Design a protein around this ligand. Sequence first.
Ligand SMILES: NC(=O)c1ccc[n+]([C@@H]2O[C@H](COP(=O)([O-])OP(=O)(O)OC[C@H]3O[C@@H](n4cnc5c(N)ncnc54)[C@H](OP(=O)(O)O)[C@@H]3O)[C@@H](O)[C@H]2O)c1
Ligand SMILES: NC(=O)c1ccc[n+]([C@@H]2O[C@H](COP(=O)([O-])OP(=O)(O)OC[C@H]3O[C@@H](n4cnc5c(N)ncnc54)[C@H](OP(=O)(O)O)[C@@H]3O)[C@@H](O)[C@H]2O)c1
Ligand SMILES: NC(=O)c1ccc[n+]([C@@H]2O[C@H](COP(=O)([O-])OP(=O)(O)OC[C@H]3O[C@@H](n4cnc5c(N)ncnc54)[C@H](OP(=O)(O)O)[C@@H]3O)[C@@H](O)[C@H]2O)c1
Ligand SMILES: NC(=O)c1ccc[n+]([C@@H]2O[C@H](COP(=O)([O-])OP(=O)(O)OC[C@H]3O[C@@H](n4cnc5c(N)ncnc54)[C@H](OP(=O)(O)O)[C@@H]3O)[C@@H](O)[C@H]2O)c1
Lengths: 246, 246, 246, 246
Amino acid sequence: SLEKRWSLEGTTALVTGGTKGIGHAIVEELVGFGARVYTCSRNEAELRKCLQEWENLKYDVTGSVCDVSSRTEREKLAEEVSSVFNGKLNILINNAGGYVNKPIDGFTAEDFSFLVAVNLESAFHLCQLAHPMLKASGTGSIVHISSCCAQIAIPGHSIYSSTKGAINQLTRNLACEWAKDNIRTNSIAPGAIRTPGTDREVSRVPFGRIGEPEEVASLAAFLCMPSASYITGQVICVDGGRTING
Amino acid sequence: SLEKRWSLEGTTALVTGGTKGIGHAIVEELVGFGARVYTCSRNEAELRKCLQEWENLKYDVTGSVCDVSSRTEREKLAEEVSSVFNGKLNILINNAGGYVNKPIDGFTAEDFSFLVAVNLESAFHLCQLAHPMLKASGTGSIVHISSCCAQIAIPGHSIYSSTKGAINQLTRNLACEWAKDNIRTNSIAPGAIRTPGTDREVSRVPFGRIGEPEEVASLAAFLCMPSASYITGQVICVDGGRTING
Amino acid sequence: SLEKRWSLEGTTALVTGGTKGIGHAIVEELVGFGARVYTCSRNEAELRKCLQEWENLKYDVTGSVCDVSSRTEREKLAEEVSSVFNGKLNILINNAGGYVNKPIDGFTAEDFSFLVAVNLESAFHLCQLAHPMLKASGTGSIVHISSCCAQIAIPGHSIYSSTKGAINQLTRNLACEWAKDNIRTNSIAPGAIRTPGTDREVSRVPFGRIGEPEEVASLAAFLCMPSASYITGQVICVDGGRTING
Amino acid sequence: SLEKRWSLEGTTALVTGGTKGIGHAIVEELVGFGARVYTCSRNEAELRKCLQEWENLKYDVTGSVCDVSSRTEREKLAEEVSSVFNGKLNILINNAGGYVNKPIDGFTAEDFSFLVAVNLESAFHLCQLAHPMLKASGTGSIVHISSCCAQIAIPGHSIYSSTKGAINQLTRNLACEWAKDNIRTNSIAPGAIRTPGTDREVSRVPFGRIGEPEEVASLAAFLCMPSASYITGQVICVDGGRTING
Ligand SMILES: NC(=O)c1ccc[n+]([C@@H]2O[C@H](COP(=O)([O-])OP(=O)(O)OC[C@H]3O[C@@H](n4cnc5c(N)ncnc54)[C@H](OP(=O)(O)O)[C@@H]3O)[C@@H](O)[C@H]2O)c1
Ligand SMILES: NC(=O)c1ccc[n+]([C@@H]2O[C@H](COP(=O)([O-])OP(=O)(O)OC[C@H]3O[C@@H](n4cnc5c(N)ncnc54)[C@H](OP(=O)(O)O)[C@@H]3O)[C@@H](O)[C@H]2O)c1
Ligand SMILES: NC(=O)c1ccc[n+]([C@@H]2O[C@H](COP(=O)([O-])OP(=O)(O)OC[C@H]3O[C@@H](n4cnc5c(N)ncnc54)[C@H](OP(=O)(O)O)[C@@H]3O)[C@@H](O)[C@H]2O)c1
Ligand SMILES: NC(=O)c1ccc[n+]([C@@H]2O[C@H](COP(=O)([O-])OP(=O)(O)OC[C@H]3O[C@@H](n4cnc5c(N)ncnc54)[C@H](OP(=O)(O)O)[C@@H]3O)[C@@H](O)[C@H]2O)c1
């Protein structure tokens, strides 16, 4: 029935990087539909402030400090989540990311390593770590936050976009290999979005404006609902038409 | 706020081909979120039966007999819709379509003409006719029902898939040209779905099953919600991973 | 051996629309590698002038007046080609096309019919008609001339781009259905090219210039060579990076 | 003129991994059109054997032992190439790669690091190192050897395909950022090819066979010719229709 198909009541979720921007919007959207959410960031003081605000509003959100670019910390994170949720995870949102803007000539080995670790390896390893919990839930949804620039060339975005292009492909492999476990995997590819993390861009957007965090968060929540049960392996741009505009 | 973003209360919608299959599911999904819907089919007796059932359930659905492959009938349809809705249309769902399965060698000129008229020209002309009403609503959403086979080669689908490939491109042009009028246009590309209209296919689906009409209808409703305000020009496959499966 | 792989010696070819622009370049490129070419246009006086120039240069090119938007004329054309080439055709280049630039609101039913007939139906029917000759050659190559704007939205190009989008899909169906007959089918999708048929466009091209007819013709010849024997079903943009430029 | 457009006479080229498989075919194809080639591999004994055979045939090929997964060795390689070619490099072919086939659950951190280093970082850093020589040549062509599985999900290919997906995106950034330097960048995405490096795959290929190294090498040579001067930023599959087959 419609009511059930459009609900996240009784679900559990992990959202990485939930203290700001898109991740923060995703946490609130998910709890809005009844999910219990676990989140993280590298900043202890900002995380407690977020968690306190959410507890004031009686949202069921918990979290811990975690740098998802660290293998040991990812392992620790998956351990706590599995204990808190009793080994059952409905939802994994790989939102934490990193950004460097330089011409190709300018990129350092350190820049490369940083972007690969936080944008690609983190998501990959966390999917691995989360697979038992996702499988155990009986209805699993992985959503990667990619970027629309993994389909076009934006000045300065070479390694950033390439790591997101890798995520787009990983989406397809996850979708197919774990379909048997009733786990779906999709990617949301935002255009420019107004965030703490963030002229010529908006000129390229048919809508003539940048997006808002909730314009990404809504689709993330939808993709986790029973209503999205036949959607998997997709890369969906949320960019006001940016990438298909001539 | 969340409640408003996920609502179609106070909206008006035209869904072509709403008496069976995907179109029927789309009508019910839209009214479920509070939309007033106008629909059509070529069959007078089946349409009255559908309309009677919906009125019994107190859904606000009206409709008339219309063959959308006929220019005169499309013009008549747009006329009634505009009068019934007082010149304001929030939503246009181009769902009515046609299907012929033959090897390329087998296709007749008549087959070609039939598929182009019902799958491409109908959608194009109705967008033209509906543009003033869509613009007048202040928040317009066009959703074409395409096909996932507009990205791969399925035996017998050559002209069918080609007309849907044309729809996919038209989506991009509509999205960009009418963004100024706060109209969004997107395409949903289903894989095999269980319908009155419809072995080796399901072997190619990671999920190992065909889809259900509501698995398409949910996304159609989502794309019309305020929550989808930064999504335009996209072609989204609803195919259980069919097209990206090796 | 290399010499053979990069040769069209002893091959036969049909190029539609060979009296101007891209088609004219394709005829000369093909004869340059030793092909015998048949071509056509709607203009009797321009065709004889082209044929006379080519005979002066001792190229083996023949041709007749044909409007490829007419079914009867397409049938007549395939009849002459099959007789001249003794029932064996190595190469079919669907280059003849049509162009209308209007906003979506502006397009007439007549505009729509014209573009579908010359850009899509002509190519489709000619592939059907040519299939026995292509199969009989033992090594068949079909190349459609599409457009890079079948992947993005250019103002005024809605129906034009949509017909080329249909061609792109048809390419995939042809490639798969006729692989058994050792026929390959590919599409070349030019950006803006300097032609008799043809500011903001070149600003969008990384190279900062429009293309030349021979920059399309070279790839057409390559795709017909033995060297391209594992290339089929592809849509290759020749656009100086236009479609992937941010 | 045609002769010049289809020639690599007087050009200089670096092909990584030229002692076997696709890379070996690419070296021979390039010298066949008159290029002077520099190549490498990790195996000293196999490289000298290849170089001796080529010198016997009077091909102008030189080379040194280099593990392109090592930064110091890449720097050393670019140093020798620049000295041997007097600071002018027309062609860079990033062919050296690595392959691991495991389910997603099975991949180790070491597997991940290995594939990223050899498939992505190596190509990226070598483009950086080669940029001055490529720019100095006045006509530069970079060709990455990707994989067709960067568009679909093949069992066991998750990290492999993801690194190639990253290469596909990097192609687009290189194409746009360095167009000003008259450098073109494209990717060739092979399906299964018969190589020393290499049942259900061939069932998925319309042609019903795997490809040969020269079926990739031909396109690599073409993309470096003056005839390809308006082709940049493209990812071209050489897969007998594998990725678009239903
Ligand atoms: N904003 C855009 O325009 C845009 C466009 C396309 C894609 N994206 C993608 O969208 C996602 C979210 O972007 P955003 O703009 O919302 O970023 P943001 O505003 O900077 O927020 C990032 C969040 O992630 C956390 N975070 C960052 N690095 C982390 C790490 N290593 N471990 C744990 N947490 C980490 C941050 O907190 P701490 O710093 O305190 O850890 C913060 O909570 C990213 O994947 C980004 O690439 C964004
Ligand atoms: N089902 C699938 O597997 C699948 C897969 C991909 C795409 N699609 C697409 O999804 C859409 C819906 O397909 P479906 O399978 O749901 O079809 P369906 O079960 O046959 O239902 C089609 C509906 O459209 C109406 N209709 C058909 N032709 C019409 C015309 N010329 N004018 C007005 N109404 C017309 C039909 O009623 P009357 O016949 O009484 O007019 C019926 O209400 C189509 O665009 C189709 O191409 C379907
Ligand atoms: N030029 C570009 O910028 C560009 C970009 C993307 C795609 N394209 C495509 O490239 C192809 C060639 O374009 P073009 O610019 O080279 O065109 P062009 O310069 O106008 O040349 C067109 C040729 O086709 C012939 N022709 C046209 N309609 C015909 C018909 N119905 N039957 C037979 N012959 C016909 C023309 O001769 P008659 O008029 O005498 O018949 C002429 O020989 C077309 O498919 C076009 O859509 C072009
Ligand atoms: N074969 C296929 O089916 C297929 C399909 C899609 C894509 N590809 C891609 O095509 C490219 C070539 O593949 P292949 O199958 O031809 O491989 P191959 O037969 O194994 O040949 C690889 C060549 O690269 C050299 N090489 C490997 N690692 C190297 C390193 N770290 N540094 C320097 N040289 C290295 C090898 O020599 P040493 O081992 O002696 O160093 C050998 O010369 C790769 O990028 C591969 O991913 C292949």
